[PDB]
Amino acid sequence: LGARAKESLDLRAHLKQVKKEDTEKENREVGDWRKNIDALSGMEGRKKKFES
Amino acid sequence: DKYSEALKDAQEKLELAEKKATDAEADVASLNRRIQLVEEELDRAQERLATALQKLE
Secondary structure, eight states: OHHHHHHHHHHHHHHHHHHHHHHHHOSSTTSOOOOOOOOOTTSOSSOSSSOO | OHHHHHHHHHHHHHHHHHHHHHHHHHHHHHHHHHHHHHHHHHHHHHHHHHHHHHHHO
16 A cells, blocks of 8 residues: 555656746746836926927 | 107017016026926935835835
């Protein structure tokens, strides 16, 4: 019985570990980066173009 | 006569220009103050928003 249980759980843990490997490789470089809008106060009012 | 009419017209146009540009200068001062107050509000918003982004992260 212990052998049956070990074989089943070992196969399960082998698939579990192969699944972990992908997460181990990278974990953050999949998300995009920050580019929020803020500041810009110092820019001038009479734009060099007429969309002012 | 020609000088009399020219002087009347000159006085009226002078008065119109003077009132126009006194109003314009008063608007200049008032609009300066409005720009500065909205600019300070904007700066304050920028500090708040900076802290906001930090807290979000």
